[PDB]
Amino acid sequence: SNFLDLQKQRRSIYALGKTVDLSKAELVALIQNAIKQAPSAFNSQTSRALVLFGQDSQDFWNKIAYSELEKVTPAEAFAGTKAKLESFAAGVGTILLFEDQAVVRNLEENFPLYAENFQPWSEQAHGIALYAIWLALAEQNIGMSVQHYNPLVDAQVAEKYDLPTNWKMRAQIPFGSIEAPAGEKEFMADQERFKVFGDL
């Protein structure tokens, strides 16, 4: 098999469970290594990550995200939110990805000739880290989805885990065993997406 097979295997999984065959040490090393190997502009390595397990992971969703969402969600709609938060907490853990703003700013100040690009290149590096993790877990038959309850949960997350303010949260990832396969995904016409020129 090749990389294309793994790419096809990787999908967004919303039905997660706790039946994984890897330990904490193996899960931690898998995640961190996947992120460490993900490239970044000038090897700035602005990628930061928080990995939660057990009660911690579940509390992030059922307590942190929960308390914040009820302050902005309609009463007649909260029931559906609580259930959704539970589905994410039903997994093995949660990964929170951050981008170190102190490193991006240091770059802007020292190399203004590039400045404008540091912010976008930082967002690009985050995406790369996200895909790196997604691929690494998919190969191990571990499912996950990408969530964006930021910056709503930012405040509480930082205080609870003594996270520097410069660590700007960009995504929260619940992961676990795959309890239900994803459905049919759609693709756009390749003709209006790509263009080839030249021969070689």
Which residues contribute to the site for a second copy (CB under 8 A)? 2-4, 6-8, 10, 12, 18, 23-24, 27-28, 30, 32-39, 43, 45, 47-57, 92-93, 117, 120, 123-128, 130-132, 134-136, 139, 148, 161, 163, 170, 185-188, 190, 193-200
Determine which residue in the list 27, 31, 40, 157 makes contact with ligand FMN, applying CB under 6 A.
40
How far does CA 3 lie from the centroid of its chain? Answer: 21
Structure tokens, 68: 């914040």
Q: Say how far apart CA 114 and CA 68 lie, in whole Å.
A: 38
Residue 11 annotated as part of some ligand binding site: yes
Residue 12 annotated as part of some ligand binding site: yes
Cα→Cα distances 150→47, 65, 71, 127, 175, Å? 16, 9, 15, 15, 18
Count the Cβ atoms, other than its own, within 10 Å of residue 84.
15
Written as one letter, the residue type at 152 is L
Smaller CB distance to a second copy: residue 66 or 93? 93
41 binds ligand FMN (CB under 6 A): yes
Nearest alpha carbon to residue 148 among 104, 88, 91: 88
182 binds, among ligand FMN, a second copy, none (CB under 5 to 8 A by kind): ligand FMN
**Could you say which residues in the range 102-161 bind ligand FMN, by CB under 6 A?**
121, 124-125, 127-128, 145-148
Q: Say how far apart CA 171 and CA 70 lie, in whole Å.
A: 20
Residue 14 annotated as part of some ligand binding site: yes
158 binds, among ligand FMN, a second copy, none (CB under 5 to 8 A by kind): none
42 binds ligand FMN (CB under 6 A): yes
